Design a protein around this ligand. Structure first.
Ligand code: PP2
Length: 256
């Protein structure tokens, strides 16, 4: 439709990350606009399911969600062209020297921005399924935007993140907006700790056992009670008893 553009009009300058699925490049749309280019390495999938991500983005357009600009799907290397996010993924950023020197003020803001984009997705009636700091991107103005809608659904190459996935989603395959709320609470842990792996020292297997036994991550050092209460809320066993992303955005804006 109005998303196909001729290869010509895209210049790939510098590589930003290799996957076992493709590359991400910083580039230019006809010299004027800085863009990111998601490369598909052929044979890996699914020159379609690679595009499922882009197809989903055509519908999901909010300011705190990475914006699609265009696609190139006619020659053998397929591209997804999006808004370029200068500071990379939220995970990477929080771990960098610069990220290590941002105080809670901005961390809570990061957190609340993500809660905002998620409040759009709930409203829109979608689920992300793969919500975590590595799937949040940061621009120059320190804006957080949600990316990677590979697993996003309206109700395969895939691999949902065990340590981020709600217990009823693991055990009964039950993915809902409320399961995303669980994932968000884990993303709060990620933010607070400056990009530490959840459940340090535990394998996916362990975690999960331990979840079936009512285990929660104990309150972490350098995390205020009120914040941990928000985390604890997102982890309520009963999915129905977890907050909405609107309540999260409200409660998060109220730290001052
Ligand atoms: C992995 C990393 C951090 C280098 N990365 N990944 C993407 C990205 C590109 C296209 C889509 Cl469809 C989704 C995400 C990205 C981006 N846009 N801007 C800056 N860094 C990006």
């Amino acid at each position: 439709p109005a998303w196909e553009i001729p290869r010509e009009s895209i210049k790939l300058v510098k590589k930003l990350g290799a996957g076992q699925f493709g590359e991400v490049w910083m580039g230019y749309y006809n010299n004027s606009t800085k863009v990111a280019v998601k490369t598909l390495k052929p044979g890996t999938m699914s020159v379609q399911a690679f595009l499922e991500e882009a197809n989903l983005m055509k519908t999901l357009q909010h300011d705190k969600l990475v914006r699609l600009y265009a696609v190139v799907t006619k020659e053998e290397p397929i591209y997804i062209i999006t808004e370029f996010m200068a500071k990379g993924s939220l995970l990477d950023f929080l771990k960098s020297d610069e990220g290590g020197k941002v105080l809670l003020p901005k961390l809570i803001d990061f957190s609340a921005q993500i809660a905002e984009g998620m409040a759009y997705i709930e409203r829109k009636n979608y689920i992300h399924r793969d919500l975590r700091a590595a799937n949040v991107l940061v621009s120059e103005s320190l804006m957080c935007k949600i990316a990677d809608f590979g697993l996003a659904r309206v109700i395969e190459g895939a691999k949902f993140p065990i340590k981020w996935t709600a217990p009823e989603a693991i055990n009964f395959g039950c993915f809902t907006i409320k399961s995303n709320v669980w994932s968000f609470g884990i993303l709060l842990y990620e933010i607070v700790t400056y990009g530490k792996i959840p459940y340090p020292g535990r394998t996916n297997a362990d975690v999960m056992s331990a979840l079936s036994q009512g285990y929660r991550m104990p309150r972490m050092e350098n995390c205020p009670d009120e914040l941990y209460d928000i985390m604890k809320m997102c982890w309520k066993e009963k999915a129905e008893e977890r907050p909405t992303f609107d309540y999260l955005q409200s409660v998060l804006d109220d730290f001052y």
